[PDB]
Amino acid sequence: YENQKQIANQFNKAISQIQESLTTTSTALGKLQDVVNQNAQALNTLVKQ
Amino acid sequence: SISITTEVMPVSMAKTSVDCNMYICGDSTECANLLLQYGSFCTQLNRALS
Amino acid sequence: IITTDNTFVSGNCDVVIGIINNTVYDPL
Ligand SMILES: *[C@@H]1O[C@H](CO)[C@@H](O)[C@H](O)[C@H]1NC(C)=O
Numbered sequence A: 001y002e003n004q005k006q007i008a009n010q011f012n013k014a015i016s017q018i019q020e021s022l023t024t025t026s027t028a029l030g031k032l033q034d035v036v037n038q039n040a041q042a043l044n045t046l047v048k049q
Numbered sequence B: 001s002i003s004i005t006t007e008v009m010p011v012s013m014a015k016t017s018v019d020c021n022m023y024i025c026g027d028s029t030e031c032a033n034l035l036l037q038y039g040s041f042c043t044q045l046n047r048a049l050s
Numbered sequence C: 001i002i003t004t005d006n007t008f009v010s011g012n013c014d015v016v017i018g019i020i021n022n023t024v025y026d027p028l
């Protein structure tokens, strides 16, 4: 209650930093990419056979 | 009383690989040309083991 | 009833946003 403004400011800056790290071309969502790749790879094999 | 208890947990196993042509054909040139008729079966099992 | 038993004291009435005026009963 005595530090409310500081806590709100830190919350806002961390929210702002998330949407910059998610813009500067990271590979944090690779776990979601791998699944997609795995599906495609398997299905491509079934065509080539 | 103060007791100390042991719990044992597995984490990993051995990393193994197989040379598909060496297992199936050995050093034969005829067997390799006959195995080429099955498409990509050695690549897929190598990928799974990796 | 708001007494000294179920309440604690911290600071002055100048930094909290939304503080009100009320009495605190003391059992003397
Ligand atoms: C609640 O909102 C009113 C309306 O702006 C404001 O006057 C009041 O100070 C606020 N109370 C707190 C505890 O933020």
Ligand SMILES: *[C@@H]1O[C@H](CO)[C@@H](O)[C@H](O)[C@H]1NC(C)=O
Pocket: C019, C020, C021
């Ligand atoms: C509480 O009492 C003080 C008297 O010192 C007064 O200055 C203050 O405005 C009062 N609080 C409110 C919310 O009016």
